[PDB]
Write a protein that binds this ligand. Structure first.
Ligand code: HEM
Ligand code: HEM
Ligand SMILES: [Ca+2]
Ligand SMILES: [Ca+2]
Lengths: 357, 357
C-alpha cells in the first residue's frame, strides 16, 4: 500500500498514477534563508512519516496536554494509500535567498496562449507540493499538515482537489476517464520506459543546471470544461474532436484502444492529431492530471505535465493546439510552472538539498 | 456493492454512510408543471440505472452518431460503489406549480443564529440531490448527469464535494475523523434502530402533512473551520472543547469511545455536553455530514442533519450551541433546508409522486 519515498528521483512522477490528488501552491513569507532550510528538513521528515502512513512527529495525541499535537489527526485509521509527496520550486522562488543565478534556463515562463483567461490568484506560486493518494483524505491530510508545519514561513496561495485521475503511467492497466467521458492516458509515458523517461522527463547534468539533475519540470494548467455545450454535442462530434471513438477509445480506423493511430485519418483539427509527438518534432510529455469540480459559475481538468525542458515539451505542443477542435469546449483559467528537484537520496537527505547546498 | 434504490423511505439517510459526497442544490427555471413532473420521472429512471452502476438511458456510446449520448460516460468502468441518490424540496419550491398549500409546517425556515455569515449564493435552493458513494467520481457523475437531463428546466444553484465522511449510522464500525482530528459520529442514530428512526427521523401522517409520510427533513450547513488557530491550540484545549479525548474519543472520565458520557464531568461549554439529547429536552438528530476543502480564503464540515421536524431537531440543538466553546473555531457560512419525500416504492413510482399526485 506504500510507495518508497527515497530515490534518485522524487516519487509521484513516473510512479503509477494514484486515484486522487490534493495540489497546493505555496508562497514564501520569510526572508530568513536558514529558517527556510530548516523548514525543508522538517517537511522532509514529515513526508517520510506521511508516505509510510504514520502520523507526523510523535503523533496526533498522547503528548503533553499543554502542547499542540504534532499531527492534526484526520488520517488516523487510514492506510498509506500509495501516498506520494512531490515538491517543486516556482520561478518566483529564485528572487529570494540569493538564488537568482540558480534559476534553470529550462524553467521558462510560459508565453501567452490564445484563449487564455488566467486567474492570477490561482496561478503561480513560489513552490508546490503534489499529494497523490488513492484516498483523498490521506492526500488532504498531508497537505494540511505540511501547511501547519510551515506556518509563519509559507502560506497556501492556491490549492486544488482532484477527485479522479485522468492520466496513466501504467499502459497495461485500465485507462481512466475524464469528465468528457473519454479514456485519457492511453499514449503517455510508462513508469517502466526508462529510456523514454531519460529522454523526455528527467533533466540531465549536461542540460545546463547541475542541481536539477534527476529532477523534472512541471506545468500545471487549470482547464475548465464547457460541460453544458459538450453534453449537447453529438457522439460523432465528440469523437471527431479527439480522433478516437468514445467507448473503445480506438483511433479512427482501428479496432482497439492501444492500436497505434494513423494520424492523417483524423480530422486536421483533432486533438490527438495535433498533440501527437509526430506532429510536434518528436516532442513528448508525461501527463499526470486529475479531474476537478469546484461548485458553480465549474468543472474540468487540472492538467499536469512533466518534461525535461518546458521549451521542448509543453510549449510547442500547446502552441500546436491553437487550432484544436477541443478549444470550443475548454478554457485555460490557471497556470503555474515549477522546477521539481531530484529525489531524497536517503534518511539524512532533504527536499531542495541540491539547490540550497 | 449496490444499495437498493426502492423502499418505503429514500436510501441515503438510514443507509450506512458512504465515504464520499457530491451534494447539489438546484433552482427550477421552468413554470410548466407538467414538464417538471416529466423531469422527475426521467430523473427517477436515471437514478435506478445510476445506483445499479449502469449508464443512463441506452448508455454512453453506441447510439446514433448524430445524437448526444444518453450518459456522459465518466463512470464507465467504475462500480456501483454503494451510490445513493436522495432528493429533497426546499421551501422556495412551494411558490411554484400551485404547491403553496402543500408546504409542510415542519419545513420551517431557520432562525438567524449568532455568528452566522451566510453566503446567499451558496444557500437555499428549490431542491437538492444528495449523491453519496465510496468513489467520488461515481457521485459526481450522478449529479452531472441529472443536471444534464434537467437542462432548460433546472440549474445548479450551488454544489459541494465532500471528500470524506464525518458521520456514522453504523456504530459498531470504525467511526471516521473530521478535519479537527476527532472521531465524529459516535453517538448518532443507527440504521438498525427502527424505533429511534420512527421517533426522531421519519415524518408520520399524524404530524400534519400526509404526502411527507415516510419522508424526513434535512438541514444543510456549510461550516468553515478556523484551521490555523485550531492547529495552535493545545491538545488539552482541543479535548476540553468537545468533552471527549482525541485518540480514543472517550468522554471525560471514561475509558472507551462508546462508553456513555457523564455530561457534568465535561466543561459547561463543551460541545457534547451542549448537544446531547439530555441537554435539549430529548431532541436527537441523524447527522450525516462530510468534510470539505475549497481552495483558499477554506475548509471545514458540510454538516447534514435529518429529523422528523426541524423545529424539534436542529433548531433547539443549534440554539443550545450558542455558548459552545467550538464556536471559537468554526463559522456557519451556508445554509439550506429541504423536505425529503418518502421513497420510490417500485419500478413505476417516481420522485415527488406523493407531492405532485
Ligand atoms: C481538458 C483538456 C484536455 C482533455 C479533455 C484531453 C483529453 C485527451 C484525450 C482523450 C486523449 C487521447 C487518449 C490519450 O492518448 O491520452 C489525449 C491525448 C493527448 N493529449 Fe490531451 N487533453 C486535454 C488537454 C491537453 C493539453 C493542454 C495538452 C498539452 C499541451 C495535451 C496533450 C496531449 C498529448 C501529448 C496526448 C497523446 C497524443 C498521442 O501521442 O497520441 N492534452 N488528451
Ligand atoms: C464543524 C462543526 C462540528 C464539528 C467539528 C462537530 C464535531 C462533533 C464531535 C467530535 C462529536 C462527538 C462524537 C459524536 O458523538 O459524534 C459531536 C457530537 C455531536 N454533535 Fe457535533 N460537530 C459540529 C457541529 C454540530 C452541529 C452544528 C450540531 C447541531 C446543530 C451538532 C450536533 C451534535 C450532536 C447531537 C452530537 C452527539 C451528542 C451526544 O448525543 O453525545 N454538531 N460533534
Ligand atoms: Ca469539424
Ligand atoms: Ca474553557
Amino acid at each position: 500500500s506504500a510507495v518508497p519515498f527515497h530515490g534518485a528521483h522524487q516519487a509521484g512522477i513516473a510512479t503509477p498514477v494514484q486515484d486522487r490528488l490534493h495540489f497546493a501552491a505555496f508562497d514564501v513569507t520569510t526572508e530568513d534563508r536558514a529558517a527556510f532550510v530548516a523548514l525543508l528538513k522538517e517537511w522532509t521528515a514529515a513526508a517520510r512519516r506521511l508516505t509510510a502512513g504514520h502520523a507526523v512527529g510523535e503523533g496526533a495525541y498522547g503528548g503533553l496536554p499543554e502542547a499542540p499535537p504534532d499531527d492534526t489527526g484526520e488520517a488516523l485509521g487510514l492506510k498509506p494509500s500509495r501516498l506520494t509527496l512531490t515538491i517543486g520550486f516556482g520561478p518566483s522562488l529564485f528572487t529570494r535567498f540569493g538564488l537568482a543565478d540558480l534559476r534553470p534556463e529550462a524553467l521558462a515562463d510560459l508565453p501567452k496562449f490564445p484563449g487564455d483567461n488566467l486567474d492570477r490568484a490561482r496561478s503561480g506560486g513560489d513552490l508546490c507540493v503534489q499529494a497523490c493518494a488513492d484516498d483523498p483524505q490521506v492526500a488532504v491530510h498531508a497537505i494540511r499538515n505540511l501547511a501547519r508545519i510551515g506556518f509563519g514561513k509559507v502560506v497556501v496561495r492556491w490549492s486544488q482537489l482532484g477527485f479522479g485521475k485522468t492520466s496513466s503511467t501504467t499502459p497495461d492497466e485500465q485507462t481512466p476517464r475524464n469528465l468528457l467521458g473519454f479514456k485519457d492516458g492511453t499514449r503517455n509515458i510508462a513508469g517502466t520506459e526508462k529510456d523514454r523517461l531519460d529522454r523526455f522527463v528527467w533533466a540531465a547534468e549536461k542540460d545546463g543546471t547541475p542541481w536539477m539533475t534527476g529532477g523534472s519540470y512541471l506545468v500545471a494548467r487549470r482547464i475548465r470544461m464547457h460541460i453544458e455545450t459538450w453534453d449537447r454535442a453529438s457522439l460523432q462530434e465528440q469523437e471527431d474532436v479527439f480522433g478516437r471513438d468514445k467507448g473503445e477509445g480506438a483511433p479512427v480506423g482501428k479496432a482497439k484502444e492501444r492500436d497505434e493511430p494513423f494520424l492523417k485519418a483524423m480530422k486536421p483539427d483533432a486533438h490527438v492529431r495535433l498533440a501527437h509527438p509526430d506532429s510536434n518534432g518528436g516532442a513528448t510529455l508525461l501527463r499526470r492530471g486529475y479531474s476537478f469540480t469546484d461548485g458553480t459559475d465549474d468543472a474540468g481538468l487540472f492538467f499536469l505535465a512533466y518534461q525535461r525542458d518546458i521549451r521542448t515539451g509543453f510549449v510547442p505542443v500547446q502552441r500546436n493546439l491553437a487550432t484544436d477542435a477541443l478549444n470550443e469546449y475548454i478554457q485555460h483559467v490557471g497556470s503555474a510552472v515549477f522546477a521539481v528537484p531530484p529525489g531524497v537520496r536517503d534518511a539524512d537527505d532533504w527536499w531542495g538539498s541540491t539547490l540550497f547546498g
